[PDB]
Amino acid sequence: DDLYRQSLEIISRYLREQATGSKKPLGEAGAAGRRALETLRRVGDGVQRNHETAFQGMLRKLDIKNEDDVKSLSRVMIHVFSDGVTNWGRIVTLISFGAFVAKHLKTINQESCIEPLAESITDVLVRTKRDWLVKQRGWDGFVEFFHVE
Ligand SMILES: CNC(=O)C[C@@H](Cc1ccc(Cl)c(Cl)c1)NC(=O)CN1C(=O)[C@@H](NC(=O)C[C@@H](N)Cc2ccc(Br)cc2)CCc2ccccc21
Ligand code: NA
């Protein structure tokens, strides 16, 4: 599953970068996936600030403390797409919520849960929106969508 592995590499690098504050080559996505990661930082940081009250509100109701709680986040995550809407905006909102959870996990000393978090975000994304992701040419479509001239 190449789409899974490539999506996981980008999502996982972004969530740990966000959690630690430390930003080397993407062995699978290459110079292109570097552009995907750079695009994720720029648009994902704008999304996080914009939905901060909503993210804080979600985190409060969830009470995420350990890996078990993190694995139960999958039931919540599918609802980023449950209104029948699929677009890159929604996809970045899901990843930014992951980066928001990843920072919280690093704060409460649960850094080990960041990788299973990246995996459950990638699983929800790739297993439920595979056809749409393939129609959009995966991360190529994402880079093109948010491209600034
Ligand atoms: C079991 N259901 C839930 O836990 C409800 C969750 C769903 C959810 C939203 C986003 C993500 Cl990143 C995930 Cl991981 C799960 N939402 C909320 O807690 C509050 N929240 C909402 O209410 C949003 N609207 C929705 O959630 C209705 C969805 N069915 C479809 C949908 C999803 C995302 C957007 Br943006 C717009 C529409 C509007 C405002 C907002 C901005 C950012 C984050 C959350 C919200
Ligand atoms: Na484990």
Q: Which two tokens stand for residue 84?
A: 């029948």
Residue type, 41: R
- Report how far apart, in Å, the C-alpha atoms of 39 and of each of 22, 77, 83, 140 are: 17, 22, 26, 11
CB proximity list for 142: less than 8 A, separation 6 or greater: 36, 39, 88, 91, 136
Pocket test for ligand 1, best of 60, 70, 79, 82 (most atoms within 8 A of CB): 79
> Using an 8 Å Cβ cutoff, are 64 and 70 in contact?
yes
* Alpha helices (H) in 51-147, listed in sequence order: 52-62, 67-71, 74-77, 88-107, 114-135, 138-145
Residue of the CA atom closest to atom 21 of ligand 1 = 54
Nearest to 28 by CA among 46, 53, 1, 48: 1
CATH number at residue 101: 1.10.437.10
Q: How many alpha carbons lie under 13 Å from residue 138 in its C-beta half-sphere?
A: 17
135 vs 140: CA distance, rounded Å:
11
Q: Please give the tally of structural domains in the chain.
A: 1
Instruction: Please return the burial class of 130, using the count of CB atoms within 10 Å of its CB with bins 0-12, 13-18 and 19+.
Output: middle
Ligand 1 atom closest to the Cα of residue 61 is: 18
- What torsion, rounded to 10 degrees, do the Cα atoms 119, 53, 81, 21 define? -30
Residue type, 15: L
- The whole domain housing 99 covers 1-146
Q: Which two tokens stand for residue 139?
A: 């991360």
Q: Ligand 1 pocket: which residues have CB below 6 Å?
A: 51, 54, 58, 76-77, 79-80, 82-83, 93-94, 97
